Design a protein around this ligand. Sequence first.
Ligand SMILES: CCCCC1C(=O)N(c2ccccc2)N(c2ccccc2)C1=O
Ligand SMILES: CCCCCCCCCCCCCC(=O)O
Ligand SMILES: CCCCCCCCCCCCCC(=O)O
Ligand SMILES: CCCCCCCCCCCCCC(=O)O
Ligand SMILES: CCCCCCCCCCCCCC(=O)O
Length: 581
Amino acid sequence: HKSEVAHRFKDLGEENFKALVLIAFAQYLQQCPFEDHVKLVNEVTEFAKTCVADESAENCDKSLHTLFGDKLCTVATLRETYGEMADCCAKQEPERNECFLQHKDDNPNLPRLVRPEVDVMCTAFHDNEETFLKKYLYEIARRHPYFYAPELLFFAKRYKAAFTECCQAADKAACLLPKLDELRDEGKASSAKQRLKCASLQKFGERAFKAWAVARLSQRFPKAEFAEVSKLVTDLTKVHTECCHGDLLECADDRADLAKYICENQDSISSKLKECCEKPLLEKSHCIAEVENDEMPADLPSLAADFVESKDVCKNYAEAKDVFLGMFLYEYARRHPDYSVVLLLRLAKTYETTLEKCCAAADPHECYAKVFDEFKPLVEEPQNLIKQNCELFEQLGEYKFQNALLVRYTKKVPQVSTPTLVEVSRNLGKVGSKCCKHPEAKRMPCAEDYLSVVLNQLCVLHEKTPVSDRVTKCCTESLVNRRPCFSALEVDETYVPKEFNAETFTFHADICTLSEKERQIKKQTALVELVKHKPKATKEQLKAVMDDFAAFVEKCCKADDKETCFAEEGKKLVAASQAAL
Ligand SMILES: CCCCC1C(=O)N(c2ccccc2)N(c2ccccc2)C1=O
Ligand SMILES: CCCCCCCCCCCCCC(=O)O
Ligand SMILES: CCCCCCCCCCCCCC(=O)O
Ligand SMILES: CCCCCCCCCCCCCC(=O)O
Ligand SMILES: CCCCCCCCCCCCCC(=O)O
């Protein structure tokens, strides 16, 4: 088409166009105030409308990069506020956009965003829904300049729906709060997944990413042909490489192209793509990215034939190693949607290590004839951990389950900071209440998805202020061995317990007037400090002390007079506990 802006404006729609332009500007000019951004959006939109009316109006022929760049260079304070970024304006567009990209700040220093009271939000929402939502949209985008724009818009729409619903209810707070917490967690998870995807692509390379995608796409589109799966994995790798570089326009066009390619060859890929392919341009790719697994052929051959029993295995493998291994991944993954992708990768790595050794020996067949027996122990490991932990989560509840994990991990890595241990254990706890509800067939994929982010949040932090070689080890190993590594950590027999600290175990009545989450976190913090002081303590000793603390807290919060009870009975509890331990 003769005009880029006009075309985009047309298939996006005015409302979507406006929100996206706002996000795009906020991610580049992270320091400019809201009023200035709104002003820019209005000018770009007004210009866009001119081009819609006549693709021949002036400047309507300019590319989007050029137009975006020219408007960015119009900001008068560009130099005084962003300094060096202002020098990007002296370059020819091609280089200009690259320069702006290089100067995008990922971890800016903006005040943390505080959640106001439910009634102020609801009142604000009713008085001016537009400015309320757009201002928060701006606040979120300036803080996450890397978050893929269209997905942020998808989140905004869900927030709107939460206010619309809850702000017109009897008990607003009881309605809205849980929705906001779920949205935030989900928002943070999405952010982590995006960063993880790019970092892994940079650290481990294209081959590893391609294997990961082959496995994932084969579980989802089992009826698709291997050649079709390879086509998709290739385009998908290119798409993420570009999206990770950070250029929104390039990223968006590649994704769109891929989404249409998929819809046009729908019948040749999966019968589950029907809905996704009838959705508007903006939602297509997102929908496809979450499509459920198509059902498998059910009348499929045995893997043993072509990969163990067959003659010429070594011959087909030597002829094209990666293609053969990819074929193996494809065949194995499409018969196992119940496996995590990383498990499939372990199987593949194991099959590769075996052919490398075995294909160089006299009688190949004999050497690699028992490969499938090496797979069994690899499979069972995550499966046992699932049942074992989910059952426990069932006996106890989410809270006591978190406490169980708390005792378990403080003992393995007592060096870690107490707030980190609490944070991590609580998140692990949630993965349990969220995945253990799924039937066995969907548990591993679920746990893998959530554990990948929790483990990455854990590693990133630790990276900053490292405290344990073991954690560093597990954090730097391959993403395939990451979870196994942590699971293999044993109690720290070297750790020297921390001296007693009266303060740490002193409690007041203010705990009675705290919110549930707040009470738990204070108790859990104490629970971690206890284990750090008495690491050799037993599950029984510990249970007894946690129970005394329990009755104690209920007793002191249920008395004609508090504070005294906590101080008087607190003296007791502490002294007794010490002796018992
Ligand atoms: C690496 C993360 C995986 C998310 C994902 C993605 O970005 N695309 C995706 C990319 C662009 C448009 C639509 C979907 N599809 C995808 C689905 C089937 C075949 C190929 C790719 C996905 O599953
Ligand atoms: C992209 C999301 C649109 C933003 C509009 C929703 C406003 C939510 C305000 C709450 C932000 C504070 C963060 C939190 O939830 O704790
Ligand atoms: C297009 C085919 C590309 C897939 C290549 C198959 C490679 C399988 C090896 C297992 C991948 C795990 C990589 C790793 O050890 O980090
Ligand atoms: C304590 C976390 C709560 C979930 C309980 C199951 C434990 C997850 C282990 C299985 C991980 C599957 C991913 C992998 O293959 O490594
Ligand atoms: C440094 C923070 C403490 C370490 C947290 C351990 C994380 C391991 C998660 C793996 C879940 C499987 C259960 C397990 O084997 O521990």
